[PDB]
Design a protein around this ligand. Structure first.
Ligand SMILES: CCCCCCCCCCCCCCCCCC(=O)OC[C@H](COP(=O)([O-])OCC(O)COP(=O)([O-])OC[C@@H](COC(=O)CCCCCCCCCCCCCCCCC)OC(=O)CCCCCCCCCCCCCCCCC)OC(=O)CCCCCCCCCCCCCCCCC
Ligand SMILES: CCCCCCCCCCCCCCCCCC(=O)OC[C@H](COP(=O)([O-])OCC(O)COP(=O)([O-])OC[C@@H](COC(=O)CCCCCCCCCCCCCCCCC)OC(=O)CCCCCCCCCCCCCCCCC)OC(=O)CCCCCCCCCCCCCCCCC
Ligand SMILES: CCCCCCCCCCCCCCCCCC(=O)OC[C@H](COP(=O)([O-])OCC(O)COP(=O)([O-])OC[C@@H](COC(=O)CCCCCCCCCCCCCCCCC)OC(=O)CCCCCCCCCCCCCCCCC)OC(=O)CCCCCCCCCCCCCCCCC
Ligand SMILES: CCCCCCCCCCCCCCCCCC(=O)OC[C@H](COP(=O)([O-])OCC(O)COP(=O)([O-])OC[C@@H](COC(=O)CCCCCCCCCCCCCCCCC)OC(=O)CCCCCCCCCCCCCCCCC)OC(=O)CCCCCCCCCCCCCCCCC
Ligand SMILES: CCCCCCCCCCCCCCCC(=O)OC[C@H](COP(=O)(O)O)OC(=O)CCCCCCCCCCCCCCC
Ligand SMILES: CCCCCCCCCCCCCCCC(=O)OC[C@H](COP(=O)(O)O)OC(=O)CCCCCCCCCCCCCCC
Ligand SMILES: CCCCCCCCCCCCCCCC(=O)OC[C@H](COP(=O)(O)O)OC(=O)CCCCCCCCCCCCCCC
Ligand SMILES: CCCCCCCCCCCCCCCC(=O)OC[C@H](COP(=O)(O)O)OC(=O)CCCCCCCCCCCCCCC
Ligand SMILES: CCCCCCCCCCCCO[C@@H]1O[C@H](CO)[C@@H](O[C@H]2O[C@H](CO)[C@@H](O)[C@H](O)[C@H]2O)[C@H](O)[C@H]1O
Ligand SMILES: COCCOCCOCCOc1ccc(C(C)(C)CC(C)(C)C)cc1
Lengths: 66, 186, 114, 103, 162, 274, 100, 89, 96, 103, 69
C-alpha cells in the first residue's frame, strides 16, 4: 500500500539548481521617482477603510427600558 | 476590548441552547463570519501595501522579473543565453495579477527602501495585524449590539450579561423564562 | 554517484559466531566435574539423557549467584500447594442446588451476560 | 507499485511533448491572440502561474486551493455515498421557537 | 572519510587546533579552507552568449578604464577584449559552469517530432543571427561562488544564529 | 446540571513503572549505539545524521528495555505492555514514523508542496517549451479546464504529493501489528500447551512429577523465549530501518562531486567590474 | 490462565473530569487575565485567548445542515414493515379477528 | 462538485422523470388489481414483479404506507400497522 | 426482513420522544422512592441516574437546531446531499 | 567554557531535533486520544462499552456484573454529589413539556 | 528504475520508450488523442462515479413532501 522513495524522484532532481547572484549596471533607473504624495493618500485610505468599518460597543442598548 | 468577554459566555449559552436560535441570530452570526473572512483579504492587502513601502527595486523585480519567478523550474543558463527566450516569450512568463501590476506601477513611485529582513516585513505585518484584529473586534462589537436589540432568548441573555451579572445567574434567569413562556412548564 | 569506497572490515560478519561460541564455551567450561560422587541415571537402553548431563553446569552457576539462589525457590512451595488443592477439588462434595443456581464459569448464564 | 508505470509514463510523455510540438509549430504570435490577452485578466492563470513561483508560493497556492475549494471537495467525496441513500424529509425549522419579549 | 579533504588537513589543524600549540596562524591556511568549495566564476552577459571573466580580461578592462578614453574607443576596446576572451573560452571547452553539478548552460533547443527538419534536430536562438563582431557587454553579471560546502544555506538553523 | 459534561478516565500503575525504564538507560548506556551508527551511515549521508540516529537509539533502547522488563521484571504493566496494540502502534511505531519528518521535515515539506504543482519530470531537461508550459500554464500537462473540478483536484493532488510517503506508514502499522500478534499468539499457544499438559498430569499423578527437571525445562524455555523474542526485536528494528531507507531516505540522495578551486587568494567582486 | 497473563488489572482508580466545568474555569481565567492586565484587542494575548474560541463558536452556530450525520439520520438498520397486501394483511386481519 | 450539482441536473431531469412516470404507472396498476382481487397477491404476480422491479424500495415503502392509510379510510382494516414507518409531517 | 434506510422520525421528534421516555423512567424512580418513604436527600441518591439521563436527553434536544430553509438547502435537497448552508469554505471553515 | 548542555536547556532543545521528537510524539498521542479515544471511550455516554465482552474483554477481571452495576452506582453517587453542591431540584425536570418542530 | 512521472530523453530531445512506443503515428493523431487528455486519471473516475450516483440519486424525501404529485 502506498508508494516509496525508490519509486519516485529525489529532492535533488526536483530543486536541482544551485544559486547564482545576478548584478546589473546602474543606468539611472531608480532615479526621479514620482508620486511623492502616494503613501500619504494610501494611509488616508487605510484609515478611512478602518473608520467606515468601525463599530463602537454601545452597552446602553441593554439598559432596562422595560 | 470588552465585548468578547461577554460573548464567550453568550456563545456557550448559544451552543448549549442552539434550539432557541432564531433566523436573525443566524444572520448575525453569518455577518460576523463574512466580516471575519474579508478580514483575511484585508490583512493580505495591507501586508502587501505596507511591505511595498520599504522594498527596493530589486525586491520588486524579484516578483516581476521572470528571471526570479522562474528559479524553481528553469535553468539560470536559459536566461544567460541571449535569444533563448524571445521578448513575447519573456512577456508571457511575467506575472499578470493585480499585485504584479501594482508593483510595476510602484517601480516609478518614491518610497523608503530598507534592507530585506524583519523590518521590511514588520512594516506590512503591523498594518495587516491591526487591520485583522480591529476588524474582527468591531465585528464582535457589532454582533453584540445586534444581539442586544434582538427580541429573543439570546438577546435577553446578552442583555443580562451586559448589566454586569454572572454567567450562571443569567442562565438561570433566562431559563426560568424559557421554561414558562417557550416550553410551557407543567 | 561513483564514490569508490574501499571495503570496511568492521561491516563484515566474521566475529559474531566466534563470540557466541566463546560465550557457549565459557558456559560449558563450568560443566567440568570430577569422577568422585558422579552418578547419572541413563535411559533404559543405557544411553544418556539430554537434561541429565547438563544439570551440573546449571547448578554450578547457581552456586555463583548471590540473591537468586536464595529467592527463586520461594515460589516452589506454591507448586505443591496446587498439587494438594487440585486433589482436594477432584472429589469435593458440593450442594446440587448451588451448583445448578450458581455454576462457576458455565455457559448461557444470563446473569453473566450470555 | 504496479507494472503499468512505464505505460503511464509513455502516455504522459506523449501528451507533454505533443503540446510542446504544437507550441513550436504555431511559432510566435501567441501574445497577439485573444486567448493570451484574456488569460492575462484570468484569475485562474494568475493562481496557476503563482503556484510555481519561489518564496513559499507553492505552499500558498496549495493552502489557498485547500481553504477555498478543497473543503468543498472533501464534502463532495463524502457526499458520493449519500446521494444514493434513502434519507428522510428535512425537518425545516418552523421559525416559531426562540422569540421572547424583553424585560 | 567521506566529506573531509586530505590536503586541507594540516591547514585545518593549524586554524582550529592552534590553541593547543600556542603558535600563531597564517591567514593563507584559512584561505585553504576554500578548497572545500568549487571555483568561483563570474559570467558577463552579452548579446550573444555569456563569457567567463578571467584575470587577463579584467586586467585589460582596468587598463582601458585607466587610459580615460572616449566611449567610442572605450566600448570598442572592451568589446575587442570580450570577443578575444569568448574565443579563448570556446577553445578551452566552454565556461567552467557548463560542467558543474547544480549549474549549467542549456544547449540549443530541440525540435520535436515533425518540427525536426531532417538532420537539423535543433533550433538555435535569435542571437545566433547576430554576427560575433557585434559582441557587446549587456552590463549584466552573474557571480557563481560554487560554494558546495561553505554556502550559508547549508549552514543550518543553529550555525547561522551562532 | 446541563453544563456539566463528565468524562471518566481508569488510571493505574504508570509513574513508578515508567521511571525505571528511563533509570535503566544509564545502565544500558545505549549499547545499541554502534549498530544504529552502522545502519544510518549505510542508509544516508547528511549533516542531520546524528539527529535521526539519536532518535532511533532512544526508541530502540526503550523497546529493548521494555522487552527485557517484559521477560524478567514481571510486574503490572511490564507484562501487558508488549501484549498491547497501543504500545506497538503509538509507543514504538509512531516515533519511528515521525522521526524522518522531524529531522528532514523542511526538505520533505518543500518537496510535498512542490509536487502539488504536478508535472512530468524530464532528465536532461534542455527544452525551452517545458519552461514556458511550467511557468505560464503551471504544469507540463494540459491544465485546460481542470479548475472546473478544482475542489477535488487540490485534495487529490495533496495525496499525489504524499503517496510516496505512505508505504512508510503502512510498514510501521504492519510491523507493529506483527509484533503484537507474535507476542500474544506465542504466549497464548505456549500457555495453552502447558495447561493441557497439566490437565494430562493432574489426572494421572504418576506423571505429576518434575519429569524433565526443575531447571532443565525452565532453562530450555528461558533460552527459547529469549532467542525467539530477540530475533523478533532484531527483525522489527532491522526491517523498520531498511524500509525507512527504501521509503523515506532515498529522497535525500544528493551526491556532490568534489570540484577543485583555483581562485583561492583572489575573488572577483562587484567592485572588480563596477 | 494464559489470557489472565494477557490482562492488565493494575488499575488504581477512575479519574472523573467535568470538562464543561474545566472549560468554564479556563474561560474565566482567560477573562481575568485579560482584564487584570488591561490588554488591548490587538495584543497577541487577546488574540490567542479570544479569536479561536470565537471562531469555533461562530462556526458551530452558523452551521445549517440540511441532514444530520450519516449514522444518525439515515443509513440506519430498520426492520421491514408489514405490507398492506398478501400474507401480512391476512395476518393482521386474523389478529384483529382473534383478539375480537 | 460543480458539474455534478450545476450541469448534471438539467441533463438527468428527463431520464429520471421517465422512471418516475413508469413507477407511478406500475404502482397504480398493481394497487388497482389488488383492489380488484381483494388484496390478493396470487393472480397479479406480473404486476407485483413490475412494481418491485421498476419502483425502488424507498418509493415502495411510501406507497405501502399510503395504501395502509387508504385501507384504514375505506374501512377494510382499523389501526393499520405502522411499526417501522416514517412518522414525518 | 431488514433494510438500511432513512430514520423513521425526524431528529427533533426523536430527541423529544427520547426525553419523554427518560422523563417516564425518572418519574417511576421518584414515585417508587416516595412509596418507600425516602426524603429529599435519599431521593437524590436514588434517582440521580435517571435525572442525569433526562438532563442529557434535554441537552441533546437543546443542542440540535432544525435547519432553516433557503435556496442552498433546497438545492442540496434536490441534489440529495448533506450540505451546510452556513459555510463558505466547507471542511476548511473549521480552520477559518 | 559555555555550553547549553550545562547552562541553558532551552537552547539545547532548540538546537537538537532529536529533542523535539519526544515532544511531538507526546503531542500527537494526546491529540489522537482527544480526537478518537476521548468521546468514544471516556465520556459518560460512551463508558458502558467497557462492559462489552467483545470490545473490552475482562476489563473488570471478569465478565461485567450487570446485577451489581458498579458504573451506575459510582456515577450516581457522583451525580448526587453534584446535585447537592448545586442544590438543584430533582423533580424540576419532570415539569417540562418540549414542543415539536411542527410542519 | 521506472520511476513515477519520470521520463528519459535521447540526443534528439525525444522521450525514450520505457515500455511502449507511440511516436510512429503522425502528429495529427497524437494531437487528437492528447488534446483532451490531462495530468489527471483518478479524479475523472471518481467524477464518473459521482455522476452515476447523481443520476441514480434518491428522491424519496421529496416524494414524502409531495413534489411529484
Ligand atoms: C476566481 C476564483 C478564485 C481563483 C483563485 C484565486 C485567484 C487569486 C490568486 O490567488 O491569484 C494569484 C494572484 C497573484 O497575482 P500575481 O501578479 O500573479 O503575483 C504577483 C507576485 O507573485 C506576488 O508576490 P507577493 O509575495 O508580493 O504577493 C503576496 C502574496 C500574499 O502575501 C502572503 O505571503 C500571505 C500568504 C497568505 C497565504 C494564504 C493563507 C493561508 C493560511 C494558512 C493555511 C493553513 C492551512 C489551513 C487548511 C487546513 C489545514 C489542516 O500574494 C498572494 O499569494 C495572493 C493571496 C491571495 C489572497 C488570498 C487570501 C486567503 C486567506 C484565507 C481565507 C480566505 C477566506 C475566503 C475569502 C473570501 C472568499 C470569497 O493573487 C492576487 O493578486 C489576488 C490578491 C488580491 C485579492 C483581492 C481579492 C478581492 C477582494 C475584493 C474586496 C473584498 C470582497 C468584495 C466583494 C467582492 C464580491 C463578492
Ligand atoms: C504581534 C504584533 C503586534 C503588533 C501590534 C501593533 C504593533 C505596533 C508597534 C509595533 C512596532 C514594530 C513591532 C512589530 C514586531 C516585529 C518587530 C520586527 O520585526 O522588527 C525587528 C527589527 C530588526 O532589525 P532589522 O530588520 O534587521 O533592520 C535592518 C535595518 O533596517 C538595516 O537596513 P537599512 O540599511 O535600510 O538601515 C536603515 C536605518 C535607517 O533608516 C532610515 O533612517 C530611513 C529608512 C526609511 C524609513 C523606514 C520606516 C521605518 C519604520 C519604523 C518606525 C520608524 C520610527 C522609529 C523611531 C521611533 C522611536 C524613536 O535603519 C532603519 O531603517 C531603522 C528604522 C528607523 C530609522 C529612522 C526613520 C525615520 C523616523 C516631514 O528591529 C528593528 O530594527 C526596529 C527598529 C525600530 C525600533 C523603533 C521601535 C519604536 C517603539 C515605539 C516608539 C514610541
Ligand atoms: C464567495 C463569494 C463572495 C460572497 C459574496 C458576498 C456575499 O454576500 O455572499 C452572498 C452569499 C450569501 O451567503 P450568506 O447570506 O452569508 O449565508 C447564509 C446562507 O448561506 C444563505 O443561503 P442562500 O440560499 O441565500 O445562498 C444563496 C447562494 C445561491 O444559491 C443558489 O443559487 C443555489 C441554486 C443554484 C442555481 C443553479 O449564494 C448566492 O446567492 C451567490 C453565490 C452562489 O454567500 C454565499 O452563499 C457563499 C457561496 C460560496 C459558494 C458556496 C456554494 C454556493 C452554491 C451552493 C449551491 C448549493 C450547494 C450545492 C453543493 C455544492 C456546494 C459547492
Ligand atoms: C478523456 C481523455 C481522452 C484521451 C484518452 C486516450 C489516452 C491517450 C493518451 C493521452 C495521454 C494520457 O492519457 O496520459 C495519462 C493521463 C493521466 O494519467 P496519469 O498521468 O497517470 O495521472 C496522474 C496521476 O498518476 C493520477 O492523477 P490524480 O490527480 O488522479 O492522483 C490523485 C490520486 C492519487 O493517484 C495515485 O497516485 C495512485 C494512488 C493509488 C490510488 C488508488 C485508489 C484510487 C481510487 C480512490 C480515489 O488520489 C487518490 O488516489 C485518492 C486516494 C486517497 C485515499 C485516502 C486514504 O490520462 C488521462 O488523460 C485521463 C483520461 C484517460 C485515461 C485512460 C488512458 C488510456 C489508456 C490506454 C492506453 C493504451 C494505449 C493507447 C495508445 C494506442 C492508441 C492507438
Ligand atoms: C467507473 C469505474 C469505477 C469502478 C471501478 C474503478 C476501476 C477504474 C477503471 C479505470 C481504468 C483506467 C486505469 C485505472 O484506473 O487504473 C487501473 C489500476 C492501475 O492503476 P495504477 O497503475 O495507478 O495503480 O489497475 C487496478 O488494479 C484496478 C483496476 C481493476 C480492473
Ligand atoms: C472561478 C472564476 C474563474 C473565471 C474564469 O475566467 O474561468 C476560467 C476557467 C478556464 O481557464 P483556463 O482556460 O486557463 O483553463 O474556467 C474554468 O476552468 C471553469 C470554471 C467554471 C465556470 C462555470 C461553468
Ligand atoms: C492532579 C492529580 C490529583 C490526584 O490526586 O490524582 C492522583 C491519582 C492517584 O490516585 P489513586 O492512587 O487513588 O488512583 O493519580 C493521578 O490522577 C495522576 C494522573 C497522571 C496523568 C495526568 C498527567
Ligand atoms: C498556565 C496557568 C493555567 C492556569 O492557571 O489555569 C487555572 C484554571 C483555573 O482553575 P480554578 O479556578 O477552578 O482553580 O484552571 C482551569 O480552569 C482548567 C485548566 C485545565 C486543567 C485540565 C488539563 C486537561 C485539559 C482538559 C480541560 C479542558 C481544556 C481546557 C483548556 C486547557
Ligand atoms: C496530560 C494529558 C492531557 C492533556 C490534555 C490537554 C488538552 C489540551 C487541548 C484542549 C483543547 C481545547 O478544545 C476545546 O475543548 C472543549 C472541551 O474541553 C470544547 O468545548 C465544548 O465542550 C464543552 C464540554 O464538553 C462545552 O462546555 C463547550 O461549550 C463546547 O465548546 C471546545 O469546543 C474545544 O475548543
Ligand atoms: C549468553 O549465551 C550463553 C548461552 O549459552 C547457553 C548454552 O546452553 C547449553 C549448555 O547446556 C549443556 C549442554 C551440554 C553439556 C555437556 C553435557 C557439554 C556434555 C558433556 C559434559 C557430556 C561433555 C553441558 C551443558
Amino acid at each position: 500500500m502506498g508508494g516509496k522513495a525508490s519509486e519516485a524522484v529525489t529532492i535533488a532532481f526536483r530543486f536541482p539548481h544551485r544559486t547564482t547572484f545576478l548584478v546589473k549596471q546602474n543606468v539611472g533607473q531608480k532615479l526621479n521617482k514620482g508620486h511623492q504624495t502616494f503613501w500619504q493618500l494610501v494611509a488616508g485610505g487605510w484609515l478611512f477603510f478602518l473608520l467606515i468599518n468601525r463599530t463602537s460597543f454601545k452597552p446602553k442598548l441593554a439598559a432596562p427600558k422595560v | 476590548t470588552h465585548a468578547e468577554l461577554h460573548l464567550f459566555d453568550l456563545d456557550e449559552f448559544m451552543q448549549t441552547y442552539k434550539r432557541l436560535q432564531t433566523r436573525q441570530d443566524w444572520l448575525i452570526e453569518n455577518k460576523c463570519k463574512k466580516s471575519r473572512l474579508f478580514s483575511y483579504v484585508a490583512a493580505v492587502i495591507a501586508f502587501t501595501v505596507g511591505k511595498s513601502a520599504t522594498m527596493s527595486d530589486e525586491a520588486i523585480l524579484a516578483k516581476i522579473d521572470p528571471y526570479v519567478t522562474s528559479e524553481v523550474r528553469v535553468q539560470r543558463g536559459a536566461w544567460w543565453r541571449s535569444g533563448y527566450f524571445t521578448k513575447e516569450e519573456v512577456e508571457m512568463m511575467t506575472p499578470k495579477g493585480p499585485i504584479a501590476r501594482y508593483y510595476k506601477f510602484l517601480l516609478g513611485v518614491r518610497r523608503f527602501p530598507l534592507k530585506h529582513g524583519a523590518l521590511s516585513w514588520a512594516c506590512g505585518f503591523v498594518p495587516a495585524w491591526l487591520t485583522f484584529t480591529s476588524l474582527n473586534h468591531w465585528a464582535q462589537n457589532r454582533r453584540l449590539n445586534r444581539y442586544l436589540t434582538q427580541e429573543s432568548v439570546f438577546g435577553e441573555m446578552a442583555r443580562e450579561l451586559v448589566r454586569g451579572k454572572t454567567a450562571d445567574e443569567a442562565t438561570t434567569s433566562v431559563m426560568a423564562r424559557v421554561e414558562k413562556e417557550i416550553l410551557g412548564v407543567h | 554517484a561513483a564514490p569508490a569506497e574501499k571495503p570496511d572490515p568492521a561491516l563484515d560478519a566474521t566475529k559474531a559466531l566466534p563470540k557466541a561460541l566463546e560465550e557457549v564455551e565459557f558456559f560449558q567450561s563450568y560443566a567440568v566435574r570430577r569422577k568422585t560422587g558422579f552418578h547419572l541415571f541413563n535411559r533404559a537402553t543405557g544411553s544418556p539423557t539430554i537434561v541429565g548431563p547438563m544439570f551440573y553446569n546449571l547448578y554450578n552457576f547457581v552456586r555463583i549467584g548471590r540473591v537468586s539462589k536464595y529467592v527463586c525457590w520461594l515460589s516452589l512451595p506454591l507448586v505443591f500447594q496446587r498439587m494438594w488443592m487440585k486433589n482436594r477439588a477432584t472429589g469435593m462434595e458440593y450442594d446440587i442446588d448451588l451448583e445448578n443456581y450458581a455454576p462457576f464459569e458455565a455457559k448461557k448464564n444470563p446473569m453473566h451476560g450470555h | 507499485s504496479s507494472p503499468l508505470v512505464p505505460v503511464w509514463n509513455d502516455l504522459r510523455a506523449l501528451q507533454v511533448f505533443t503540446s510542446q510540438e504544437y507550441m513550436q509549430k504555431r511559432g510566435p504570435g501567441f501574445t497577439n491572440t485573444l486567448e493570451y490577452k484574456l488569460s492575462c485578466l484570468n484569475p485562474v492563470k494568475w493562481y496557476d502561474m503563482m503556484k510555481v513561483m519561489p518564496g513559499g508560493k507553492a505552499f500558498v497556492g496549495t493552502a489557498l486551493g485547500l481553504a477555498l475549494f478543497g473543503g468543498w471537495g472533501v464534502e463532495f467525496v463524502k457526499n458520493i455515498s449519500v446521494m444514493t441513500k434513502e434519507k428522510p424529509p428535512i425537518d425545516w425549522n418552523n421559525e416559531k421557537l426562540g422569540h421572547l419579549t424583553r424585560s | 572519510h567521506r566529506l573531509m579533504l586530505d590536503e586541507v588537513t594540516e591547514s585545518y589543524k593549524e586554524i582550529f587546533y592552534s590553541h593547543y600549540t600556542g603558535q600563531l596562524r597564517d591567514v593563507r591556511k584559512c584561505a585553504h579552507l576554500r578548497l572545500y568549495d568549487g571555483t568561483s566564476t563570474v559570467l558577463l552577459l552579452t548579446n550573444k552568449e555569456p563569457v567567463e571573466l578571467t584575470s587577463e580580461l579584467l586586467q585589460k578592462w582596468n587598463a582601458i578604464k585607466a587610459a580615460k578614453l572616449s566611449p567610442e574607443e572605450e566600448k570598442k576596446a572592451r568589446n575587442e577584449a570580450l570577443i578575444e576572451a569568448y574565443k579563448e573560452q570556446e577553445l578551452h571547452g566552454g565556461p567552467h559552469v557548463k560542467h558543474m553539478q547544480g549549474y549549467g548552460i542549456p544547449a540549443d533547443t530541440p525540435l520535436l517530432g515533425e518540427n525536426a527538419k531532417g538532420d537539423q534536430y535543433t533550433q538555435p536562438p535569435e542571437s545566433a543571427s547576430i554576427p560575433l563582431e557585434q559582441l557587446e557587454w549587456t552590463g549584466d553579471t552573474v557571480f557563481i561562488p560554487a560554494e558546495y560546502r561553505t554556502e550559508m544555506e547549508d549552514w543550518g538553523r543553529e550555525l547561522t544564529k551562532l | 446540571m446541563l453544563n456539566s459534561n463528565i468524562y471518566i478516565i481508569i488510571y493505574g500503575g504508570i509513574i513508578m513503572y515508567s521511571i525505571m525504564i528511563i533509570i535503566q538507560m544509564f545502565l544500558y548506556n545505549f549499547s545499541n549505539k554502534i549498530y544504529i551508527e552502522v545502519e544510518i551511515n549505510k542508509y544516508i549521508l547528511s549533516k542531520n545524521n546524528i539527529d535521526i540516529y539519536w532518535i532511533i537509539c532512544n526508541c530502540t533502547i526503550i523497546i529493548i528495555i521494555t522487552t527485557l522488563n517484559h521477560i524478567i521484571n514481571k510486574i503490572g504493566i511490564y507484562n501487558m505492555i508488549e501484549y498491547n496494540i497501543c504500545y506497538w502502534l503509538i509507543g514504538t511505531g509512531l516515533g519511528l514514523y515521525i522521526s524522518p519528518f522531524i529531522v528532514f521535515g523542511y526538505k520533505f515539506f518543500v518537496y510535498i508542496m512542490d509536487l502539488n504543482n504536478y508535472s512530468l519530470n524530464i532528465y536532461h531537461n534542455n527544452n525551452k517549451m517545458n519552461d514556458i508550459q511550467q511557468i505560464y500554464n503551471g504544469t507540463n500537462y494540459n491544465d485546460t479546464m481542470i479548475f472546473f473540478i478544482k475542489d477535488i483536484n487540490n485534495i487529490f493532488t495533496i495525496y499525489r504529493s504524499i503517496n510516496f510517503f505512505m508505504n512508510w506508514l503502512y510498514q510501521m502499522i504492519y510491523y507493529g501489528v506483527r509484533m503484537w500478534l507474535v507476542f500474544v499468539l506465542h504466549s497464548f499457544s505456549l500457555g495453552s500447551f502447558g495447561e493441557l499438559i497439566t490437565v494430562i498430569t493432574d489426572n494421572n499423578l504418576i506423571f505429576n512429577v518434575f519429569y524433565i527437571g526443575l531447571l532443565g525445562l525452565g532453562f530450555i524455555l528461558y533460552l527459547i523465549v529469549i532467542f525467539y523474542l530477540g530475533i523478533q526485536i532484531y527483525v522489527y528494528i532491522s526491517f523498520s530501518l531498511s524500509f525507512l531507507h527504501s521509503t523515506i531516505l532515498l529522497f535525500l540522495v544528493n551526491y556532490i562531486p568534489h570540484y577543485n578551486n583555483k581562485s583561492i587568494f583572489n575573488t572577483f567582486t562587484n567592485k572588480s567590474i563596477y | 490462565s494464559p489470557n489472565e497473563h494477557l490482562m492488565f488489572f493494575d488499575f488504581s482508580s477512575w479519574l472523573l473530569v467535568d470538562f464543561g466545568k474545566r472549560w468554564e474555569r479556563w474561560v474565566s481565567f482567560k477573562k481575568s487575565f485579560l482584564t487584570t492586565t488591561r490588554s488591548p484587542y490587538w495584543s497577541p494575548q487577546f488574540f490567542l485567548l479570544t479569536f479561536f474560541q470565537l471562531r469555533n463558536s461562530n462556526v458551530k452556530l452558523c452551521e445549517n445542515w440540511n441532514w444530520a450525520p450519516k449514522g444518525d439520520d439515515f443509513n440506519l438498520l430498520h426492520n421491514s414493515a408489514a405490507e398492506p397486501f398478501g400474507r401480512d394483511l391476512k395476518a393482521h386481519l386474523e389478529r384483529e379477528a382473534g383478539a375480537k | 462538485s460543480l458539474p455534478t450539482f450545476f450541469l448534471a441536473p438539467p441533463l438527468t431531469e428527463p431520464f429520471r422523470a421517465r422512471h418516475r412516470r413508469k413507477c407511478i404507472e406500475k404502482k397504480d396498476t398493481f394497487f388497482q388489481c389488488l383492489d380488484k382481487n381483494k388484496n390478493e397477491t396470487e393472480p397479479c404476480e406480473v404486476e407485483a414483479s413490475g412494481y418491485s422491479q421498476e419502483c425502488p424500495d424507498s418509493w415502495r415503502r411510501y406507497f405501502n404506507e399510503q395504501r395502509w392509510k387508504a385501507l384504514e379510510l375505506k374501512g377494510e382494516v382499523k389501526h393499520a400497522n405502522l411499526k417501522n414507518t416514517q412518522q414525518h409531517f | 426482513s431488514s433494510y438500511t434506510g432513512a430514520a423513521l422520525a425526524p431528529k427533533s421528534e426523536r430527541l423529544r420522544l427520547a426525553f419523554e421516555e427518560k422523563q417516564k423512567d425518572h418519574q417511576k424512580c421518584i414515585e417508587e422512592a416516595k412509596g418507600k418513604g425516602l426524603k429529599k436527600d435519599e431521593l437524590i441518591d436514588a434517582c440521580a441516574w435517571t435525572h442525569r439521563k433526562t438532563i442529557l436527553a434535554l441537552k441533546d434536544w437543546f443542542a440540535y437546531r432544525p435547519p432553516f430553509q433557503d435556496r442552498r438547502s433546497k438545492w442540496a435537497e434536490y441534489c440529495s446531499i448533506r450540505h451546510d448552508s452556513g459555510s463558505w469554505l466547507g471542511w476548511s471553515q473549521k480552520f477559518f | 567554557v559555555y555550553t547549553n548542555w550545562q547552562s541553558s536547556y532551552t537552547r539545547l532543545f532548540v538546537s537538537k531535533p532529536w529533542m523535539w521528537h519526544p515532544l511531538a510524539w507526546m503531542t500527537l498521542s494526546v491529540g489522537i486520544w482527544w480526537k478518537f479515544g476521548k468521546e468514544s471511550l471516556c465520556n459518560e455516554r460512551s463508558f458502558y462499552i467497557h462492559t462489552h465482552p467483545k470490545w473490552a474483554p475482562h476489563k473488570f477481571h471478569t465478565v461485567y456484573n450487570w446485577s451489581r452495576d458498579p458504573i451506575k452506582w459510582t456515577l450516581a453517587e457522583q451525580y448526587a454529589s453534584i446535585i447537592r453542591n448545586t442544590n438543584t431540584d430533582i423533580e424540576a425536570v419532570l415539569k417540562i413539556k418540549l414542543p415539536a418542530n411542527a410542519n | 528504475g521506472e520511476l513515477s512521472e519520470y521520463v528519459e530523453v535521447n540526443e534528439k530531445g525525444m522521450p525514450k520508450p520505457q515500455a511502449l512506443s507511440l511516436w510512429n503515428m503522425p502528429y495529427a493523431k497524437r494531437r487528437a488523442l492528447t488534446k483532451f487528455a490531462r495530468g489527471v486519471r483518478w479524479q475523472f473516475i471518481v467524477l464518473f462515479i459521482a455522476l452515476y450516483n447523481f443520476k441514480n440519486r434518491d428522491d424519496s424525501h421529496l416524494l414524502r413532501r409531495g413534489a411529484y404529485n
